[PDB]
Structure 1
Amino acid sequence: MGEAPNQALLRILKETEFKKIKVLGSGAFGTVYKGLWIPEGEKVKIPVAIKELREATSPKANKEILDEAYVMASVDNPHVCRLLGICLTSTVQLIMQLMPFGSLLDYVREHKDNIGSQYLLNWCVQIAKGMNYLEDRRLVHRDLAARNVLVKTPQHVKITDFGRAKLLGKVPIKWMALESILHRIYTHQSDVWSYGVTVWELMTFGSKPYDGIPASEISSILEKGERLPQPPICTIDVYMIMVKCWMIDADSRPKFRELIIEFSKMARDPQRYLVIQGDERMHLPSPEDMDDVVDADEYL
């Protein structure tokens, strides 16, 4: 025992236990469907996202989806997405929890006129909680960004996208720490950098970081000492935390546990820390042969 044994269970599901209802999106990875999973013998209906392979089943693609599935089967935290199982059909399918409100990036862009300070600062806490869990599990995420946080409810977000994640190419330069761009060094403290950019995406309502700058210049821009600008809604309190995440010395950046502490202090008095016009009034969502629908988080 030099590392501890990963005693996670990989569950293999029959195709007959589930049904695809609509497509939620498609890329070069394949297709995410909305479905229901109904495990045999249990009077339980579980809403799922089924990520099917690209149909072009291929040793390289099949390798990489199973690496993602390895990590997603191995995590268990309220702010991290878990895999429910695999189906080993001709195109392999990962069965995941449905996060019905989508990515947090798209959510902030769509709902900006009704997102208030309490929600933004609570999202920051939740992402810091889930990243602190990944640090405990010894996983460096390597692709933290507001695209890769999903919304179960507006009150409940989870980190996803474990397809870069590593223990202990085309790359997302504008979320990466300087050591990662220059030297390929990745650490928990380089995910802290990306957390800073992620918070910046949220507090700017989904604005693109470094918009217009070619990715070759980013490393030189950063070496010269420039960072992303203070979002309009942000007090110096919140923005100084973003700045601290973007220090050159990685050990001078905050820990995820300290981000939990700081953002949760701020979340007890939101309007002292983010200034949003109309904040006091803003009210967001809180939610069909569907008697036996249980969410995956209650199906242990």
Structure 2
Amino acid sequence: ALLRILKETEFKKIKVLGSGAFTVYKGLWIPEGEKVKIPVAIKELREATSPKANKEILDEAYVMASVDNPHVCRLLGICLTSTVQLIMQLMPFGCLLDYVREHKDNIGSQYLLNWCVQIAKGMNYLEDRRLVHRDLAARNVLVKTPQHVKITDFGLAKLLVPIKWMALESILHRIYTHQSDVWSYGVTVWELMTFGSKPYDGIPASEISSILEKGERLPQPPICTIDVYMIMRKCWMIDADSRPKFRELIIEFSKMARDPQRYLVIQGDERMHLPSPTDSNFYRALMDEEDMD
């Protein structure tokens, strides 16, 4: 019941928001018998085969329609035609990568650390459900409000290549576990703490696996103390079961979000605080009524 099969005639694509490797549209759901048009997000993929890619897509979409977590985007509906179209809640703020990139001069420690906690809470839920993201990145974290981030694009990757966000065991042997997701998680934290820098900028993807084996890792971002950089460093250990668990990651960034400036050194950090409750409640009443935003 968590996945609504839609007819083509009851939703319309309107404007393109972006496109990657799996095209995302700002669209309009028209419920039958009504005069309202309800904004939705529509992701359309490449070609598809009826004699095959139907249940394979539909059965795995039911999995994606079952994720129930404040920090993981749920698939709401599907339309199975020549193409494949997935309908989800439109998030008007866009991805966290472009967000922190357009707001470099305005992301405090309280936000950054809280975003880590939220991403780890999302990722930790997927593990409790025995599910592997396969494509975690700052571009796959959506901004519902600036105070509430949600992971997106779960289970896309498996049903359909981001070398610079994959663990070595995944580049070399195509092994994808919850511990490989932790690697990608660590890279995402690096994108966030650099305000959106490209990982291994300029280095060809072909050569990433070698530099990992000789022990290149992403550099400690300026604003990071070694406590945070150590945590990052531990995500990219060669031995996957030496990497932190998502559940450990929640507790630690939570600890650090309780004294933000001791762990991140941002200029004027004292003036870029979280919203007052008043602002927070107004935000939620219009944009984010979710049970535990």
TM-score range, shorter chain: 0.7 to 0.9
Paired residue total = 289
Counterparts of residues 94-113 of structure 1 (less than 5 Å): 94-113=86-105
1:86 Cα deviation from its structure 2 partner: 1.8
SS in 1 for 2:278: coil
1:113 Cα deviation from its structure 2 partner: 0.6
Matched, 1:26 2:19: yes
- Normalization by structure 2: what TM-score? 0.84
Identity of matched residues, %: 96
CA distance 1:65–1:245, change in 2 (3 Å) = same
Q: Judge conservation of contact 2:70–2:292 (CA < 8 Å) in 1.
A: no
CA distance 1:105–1:248, change in 2 (3 Å) = same
- Residue in 1 that maps onto 2:218: 228
1:72 Cα deviation from its structure 2 partner: 2.2
Name the CA distance, whole Å, in 2 between partners of 1:290 and 1:201: 26
Q: Larger deviation: 71-80 or 8-17? A: 8-17
Name the CA distance, whole Å, in 2 between partners of 1:206 and 1:163: 24
1:93 Cα deviation from its structure 2 partner: 2.6
Q: Judge conservation of contact 1:46–1:294 (CA < 8 Å) in 2.
A: no
Name the CA distance, whole Å, in 2 between partners of 1:289 and 1:270: 21
Name the CA distance, whole Å, in 2 between partners of 1:288 and 1:260: 26
Q: Judge conservation of contact 2:132–2:177 (CA < 8 Å) in 1.
A: yes
CA distance 1:295–1:50, change in 2 (3 Å) = farther
Q: Larger deviation: 266-275 or 212-221? A: 212-221
- Structure 1 unmatched ranges of 5 or more: 1-7
Kindly provide the CA deviation profile for residues 162-217 of structure 1, in whole angstroms up to 9, marking residues without a partner as x: 3555599xx21111111111222221111111111110010001101111212232
Name the CA distance, whole Å, in 2 between partners of 1:102 and 1:282: 21
CA distance 1:227–1:26, change in 2 (3 Å) = closer
- Normalization by structure 1: what TM-score? 0.82
1:87 Cα deviation from its structure 2 partner: 3.1
Name the CA distance, whole Å, in 1 between partners of 2:279 and 2:235: 48
What is the root-mean-square deviation of aligned Cα atoms in Å? 4.4
Kindly provide the CA deviation profile for residues 76-103 of structure 1, in whole angstroms up to 9, marking residues without a partner as x: 1111111111234554432111111111
Q: Judge conservation of contact 2:140–2:152 (CA < 8 Å) in 1.
A: yes
Q: Judge conservation of contact 1:233–1:275 (CA < 8 Å) in 2.
A: yes
CA distance 1:108–1:67, change in 2 (3 Å) = farther
Q: Judge conservation of contact 1:46–1:295 (CA < 8 Å) in 2.
A: no
Q: Judge conservation of contact 2:190–2:221 (CA < 8 Å) in 1.
A: yes
- Residue in 1 that maps onto 2:39: 47
1:161 Cα deviation from its structure 2 partner: 1.3
SS in 2 for 1:274: coil
1:260 Cα deviation from its structure 2 partner: 0.2
1:191 to 181, 197, 203: 181
Q: Judge conservation of contact 1:101–1:151 (CA < 8 Å) in 2.
A: yes
Q: Judge conservation of contact 1:140–1:167 (CA < 8 Å) in 2.
A: no
Counterparts of residues 1-300 of structure 1 (less than 5 Å): 9-26=2-19, 29=22, 31-40=23-32, 46-54=38-46, 66=58, 69-88=61-80, 91-165=83-157, 171-282=161-272, 297=290
Q: Judge conservation of contact 1:104–1:147 (CA < 8 Å) in 2.
A: yes
1:28 Cα deviation from its structure 2 partner: 6.4
1:69 Cα deviation from its structure 2 partner: 3.2
1:289 Cα deviation from its structure 2 partner: 24
Q: Judge conservation of contact 1:139–1:165 (CA < 8 Å) in 2.
A: no
Q: Judge conservation of contact 1:114–1:284 (CA < 8 Å) in 2.
A: no
CA distance 1:247–1:58, change in 2 (3 Å) = same
- Residue in 2 that maps onto 1:4: none
Name the CA distance, whole Å, in 2 between partners of 1:25 and 1:275: 33
Q: Larger deviation: 219-228 or 8-17? A: 8-17
Name the CA distance, whole Å, in 2 between partners of 1:257 and 1:172: 25
Q: Larger deviation: 116-125 or 171-180? A: 171-180
Name the CA distance, whole Å, in 2 between partners of 1:290 and 1:39: 31
CA distance 1:25–1:132, change in 2 (3 Å) = same
Q: Judge conservation of contact 1:115–1:284 (CA < 8 Å) in 2.
A: no
Q: Judge conservation of contact 1:114–1:283 (CA < 8 Å) in 2.
A: no
Name the CA distance, whole Å, in 2 between partners of 1:95 and 1:280: 40
Q: Judge conservation of contact 1:125–1:259 (CA < 8 Å) in 2.
A: yes
